[PDB]
Write a protein that binds this ligand. Structure first.
Ligand code: PLM
Ligand code: PLM
Lengths: 129, 129
């Protein structure tokens, strides 16, 4: 129903392989690969505000689903894309050669980003406030 | 008694002036100044683990009070210093020309970092799980 919450990273797969594939320096990969931080989502209807802890970087993006928005990626590149809401619990987008799916089930968010034959998956759990 | 917990930044004063004085790139100052993230402390006796969201960076430091420690600063430089306990609820350290005081008051943490005539102050609040 609502994505709003603070989510602590529980586990992830292929962080290093994904970050190497998009061109992140090995120095940043090693610094960030073991960080299990907190991301925050605020949802207001179709409007989303994301404060994402991704490795050693914090990225803050804002978008209305269905509208073109400029979003900052891991590389610092700002891409223009459209994020769609599928059902009430799935955010779907594609930028460059990456497909990203953000799925909420109960208190668990599963983020799956596919780049070629690399599937980068993050599992995070809502902090019960 | 215990600093352990997750803390969300509530307010801060003089971020830009402090970050300019320590030489952070202007582009990182502008993107980080409005981020209100979550920092995590894990305390075991005199041993501390910090995962700090500071602007658009995540910094992870460990140390034991009273023992010389190597700590990463906001600029990425590693400094060697000793963190002291003043009372039971204040952590105090000096490095370079900066004095840092971290004070716990119930669910509120206040971090005060003095550099010459600039006082950079962060107030955060415990996330109640
Ligand atoms: C498409 C813009 C974001 C770019 C950053 C990519 C790094 C992974 C992003 C996943 C965050 C999705 C929100 C769920 C919580 C989390 O996994 O932190
Ligand atoms: C002593 C250098 C540590 C890294 C420098 C980053 C500047 C901000 C440090 C403040 C963090 C103190 C912990 C309280 C929680 C918080 O304010 O995020």
């Amino acid at each position: 129903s609502s994505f709003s919450g603070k989510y602590q990273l529980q586990s992830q797969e292929n962080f290093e392989a994904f970050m190497k594939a998009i061109g992140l320096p090995e120095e940043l990969i090693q610094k960030g690969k073991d960080i299990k931080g907190v991301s925050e989502i605020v949802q207001n209807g179709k409007h989303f505000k994301f404060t994402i802890t991704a490795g050693s970087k914090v990225i803050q993006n804002e978008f209305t689903v269905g509208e073109e928005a400029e979003m900052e990626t891991m590389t610092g590149e700002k891409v223009k894309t459209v994020v769609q809401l599928e059902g009430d619990n799935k955010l779907v987008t594609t930028f460059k050669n990456i497909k990203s799916v953000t799925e909420l089930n109960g208190d668990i968010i599963t983020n799956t980003m596919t780049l070629g034959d690399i599937v980068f998956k993050r599992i995070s759990k809502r902090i019960l406030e």
